[PDB]
Structures are given as C-alpha cells and as structure tokens.
Amino acid sequence: SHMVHHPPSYVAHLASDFGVRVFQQVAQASKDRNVVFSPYGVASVLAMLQLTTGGETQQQIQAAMGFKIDDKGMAPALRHLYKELMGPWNKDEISTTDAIFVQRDLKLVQGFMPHFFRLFRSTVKQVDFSEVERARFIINDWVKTHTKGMISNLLGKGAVDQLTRLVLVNALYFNGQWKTPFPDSSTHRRLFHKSDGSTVSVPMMAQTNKFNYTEFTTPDGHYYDILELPYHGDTLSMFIAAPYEKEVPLSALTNILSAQLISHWKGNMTRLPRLLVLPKFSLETEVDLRKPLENLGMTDMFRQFQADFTSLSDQEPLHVAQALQKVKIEVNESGTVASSSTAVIVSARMAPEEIIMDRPFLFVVRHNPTGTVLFMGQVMEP
Numbered sequence: 480s481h482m483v484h485h486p487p488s489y490v491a492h493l494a495s496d497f498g499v500r501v502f503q504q505v506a507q508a509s510k511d512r513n514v515v516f517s518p519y520g521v522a523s524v525l526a527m528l529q530l531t532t533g534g535e536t537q538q539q540i541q542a543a544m545g546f547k548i549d550d551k552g553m554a555p556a557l558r559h560l561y562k563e564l565m566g567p568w569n570k571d572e573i574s575t576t577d578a579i580f581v582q583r584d585l586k587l588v589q590g591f592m593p594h595f596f597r598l599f600r601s602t603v604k605q606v607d608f609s610e611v612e613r614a615r616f617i618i619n620d621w622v623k624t625h626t627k628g629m630i631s632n633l634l635g636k637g638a639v640d641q642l643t644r645l646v647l648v649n650a651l652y653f654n655g656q657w658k659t660p661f662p663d664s665s666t667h668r669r670l671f672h673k674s675d676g677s678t679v680s681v682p683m684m685a686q687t688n689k690f691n692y693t694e695f696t697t698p699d700g701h702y703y704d705i706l707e708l709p710y711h712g713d714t715l716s717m718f719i720a721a722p723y724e725k726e727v728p729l730s731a732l733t734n735i736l737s738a739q740l741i742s743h744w745k746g747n748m749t750r751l752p753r754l755l756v757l758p759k760f761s762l763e764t765e766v767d768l769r770k771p772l773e774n775l776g777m778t779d780m781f782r783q784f785q786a787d788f789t790s791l792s793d794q795e796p797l798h799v800a801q802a803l804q805k806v807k808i809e810v811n812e813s814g815t816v817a818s819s820s821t822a823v824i825v826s827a828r829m830a831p832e833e834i835i836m837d838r839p840f841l842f843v844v845r846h847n848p849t850g851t852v853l854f855m856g857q858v859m860e861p
C-alpha cells in the first residue's frame with residue numbers, strides 16, 4: 480500500500496504533496512521567513528491550469544503535480560473530496576471556490592466548458608479587462624466575498640491592465656474553534672530576543688491537556704517536538720513542530736518536509752499530557768510563485784512564445800506574467816481564522832515581495848479524514 484496507489488483515490492495526498500513542495504521553494508528562498516501559505520490553494524489553481532494549457536506547457540505542469548486532472552475517475556474523486564471538506568459533519572467551516580476570468584470577446588474551445596464544470600463546478604467569467612479599474616474591482620470583490628471579507632484587495636494598483644486576458648483564482652477560507660480553548664487567564668506577554676540584541680513583547684497563550692504528541696529526529700540528528708492541536712469538529716487539527724535547540728535552524732526541518740512526513744507524524748503519535756505555549760498571532764503575507772513554479776519545471780507558461788494555452792483558446796496567444804498567493808491567518812484563544820487567495824495573471828506585474836524574518840516554528844492546518852493540507856506557515860518562536 481505504501482508503494483502502489485490508485486491516483487484518483489490518492490488525489491488529496493498528491494495535491495497536498497505538490498503544494499508542500501511549492502512551500503519548500505518559498506521557504507528555501509529566504510532564511511527564517513515568517514510566512515503563511517496554502518498548499519491546497521496552489522494545487523487547485525494549478526489543477527485548473529492543467530485544463531487551460533496544452534502541449535509542453537501542460538506536460539510540465541502534470542509532471543510537477545505528479546497526476547493528471549483529466550484521468551478516468553478523477554471527476555468523481557474530486558466531487559467526493561469537495562463534499563468531505565465542505566460537509567457539516569466537520570463543524571469548523573471550510574470554503575473553497577475556483578474562478579477563471581477571461582477577456583469577453585475571446586473564443587474558447589468547445590470542449591473546455593464541460594471539463595471545467597465536471598471537475599470544478601465552475602463557469603468561466605467573462606470580463607472586459609480594457610476597463611482596467613472596473614475589472615480589478617470585479618475580481619477583487621469576488622475574492623473579498625469568497626474569503627468572507629478577509630482578503631479585500633488582492634489586486635492592487637498595477638496588478639492587471641488592458642493587455643490582461645486571463646486570471647485564475649482560488650479563494651480558500653477556514654474558520655475553526657479549538658476543541659479546548661486556551662484559558663484567558665494564562666494569556667501573557669512574553670519576550671522574544673531578536674538577533675540585533677533587542678527585544679519585543681509578544682502575547683502568548685497556554686493550555687495543559689492530553690495532546691497527541693510525538694518526538695522527531697532528522698537524518699542529521701536534530702530534535703523537534705510535534706504536537707497536535709485539534710479543532711472541535713474532530714476532523715481538523717493544527718500540527719505544531721518546535722526545535723529543542725536554539726542552534727538548529729528551521730530549514731533542517733522544512734528541507735525534508737513532505738505530506739507523507741505529516742501523515743507519518745499523525746500516524747505515529749500518542750496521547751500524552753503536555754503544556755502548550757503558543758503565540759496569539761496574526762500574520763499576513765503575499766508570496767510570488769513564478770520562481771518557485773519555474774524551479775519545479777513549469778517554465779513554458781511564463782514564456783511569451785513557448786506558452787501553450789490551446790486547450791482554452793487557439794484564437795490568440797497567451798502567457799503568464801504573475802503567479803502569487805496572499806494569505807491571512809489569525810490565531811487567538813477561541814480558535815483560528817485563515818484565508819488564502821491564489822492567482823495567476825496574464826500581463827501587468829507584481830510589486831516586489833515584502834519579507835519578514837525571525838527564528839520561527841512550523842504549523843500545519845490539516846483536514847485529517849482526507850489528508851488535505853489547507854494552510855501551513857513559519858511563525859515567530861516563543
């Protein structure tokens with residue numbers, strides 16, 4: 480069973496593994512980067528890109544993701560995966576939506592509409608991008624809606640222009656209540672010692688409970704606590720990995736990180752009494768994916784005369800200028816609220832990346848019945 484898999488029956492893991500690998504690229508770019516990410520959000524947009532691209536452009540994408548979205552049986556597996564995530568038995572709220580915004584006078588290949596509907600239950604949204612500010616507002620309002628108001632201005636000044644012809648977006652929203660809330664009385668400020676010899680007062684939470692816990696050591700010998708913090712629906716939890724030593728950089732963990740690794744942790748954990756100290760944080764970040772996707776073999780889609788979008792339209796040539804992801808998380812005593820908006824844009828440009836860096840720990844938000852990794856991030860260590 481570990482060596483042989485039926486791909487549609489394994490799509491959750493495959494999509495999660497691909498999305499994790501994209502996070503590694505983002506993490507490997509900057510040391511100790513405080514960033515929040517959605518593996519599931521990037522997998523959903525790139526899966527859409529498998530329907531829109533053709534030729535080598537599509538080949539390259541299917542290769543990196545390590546599965547084909549149009550394989551026999553994928554459709555019913557995707558319907559089942561959506562239901563499992565969305566259903567009310569989860570208690571904690573999850574919401575995922577996908578959209579393709581396309582220049583209105585653009586003739587699309589006949590076979591595209593049924594595919595997009597079979598796999599994404601979605602319908603291409605025609606917009607006239609030559610009306611730049613209106614179009615920016617149309618896509619922005621849609622993102623603001625499907626993230627429940629959390630991401631209001633994904634697309635700022637210059638993110639789209641008259642030459643924009645295609646935008647693909649996924650909006651992902653998560654709202655969970657801890658199974659056991661952290662008690663208000665044990666919230667306190669704690670000091671964090673920066674590298675420049677200075678200090679900052681950070682609000683800290685704490686709770687003692689029986690937590691699924693495991694120890695973990697890497698090939699080079701470095702130790703980490705892995706604790707699982709559950710949401711009240713019993714289907715979702717936050718896995719937390721924290722290093723034992725201040726001399727071990729988090730890259731020793733993130734460089735070997737995988738979806739199977741997290742599955743192995745969850746599989747090999749035991750319930751133990753532990754005190755948990757976790758920060759009360761809000762993190763908002765936006766990462767470029769162009770380079771990270773280029774590093775994983777997907778270069779054709781960004782290149783003016785090599786790019787092949789013929790499964791969507793052979794009417795006119797198209798290539799990707801921007802691939803990005805804007806993400807927001809808020810963790811308090813009663814729970815977590817997180818959202819992400821993943822976008823691939825033709826034309827215009829992406830403002831330079833703003834990067835914050837500070838010795839971090841790792842968190843993973845994971846839907847357990849399916850193995851779907853929804854959010855993961857590197858945040859400031861207590």
Ligand SMILES: CC(C)(C)OC(=O)N1CC(Nc2nc3ncccc3c(=O)[nH]2)C1
Nearest residue numbers: 494522523526557561575576577599600
């Ligand atoms: C596994 C992978 C990340 C490739 O895709 C999925 O998990 N699927 C969920 C499907 N997306 C989807 N499914 C939907 N189902 C009903 C209503 C709306 C939607 C929608 O907007 N998107 C694709």
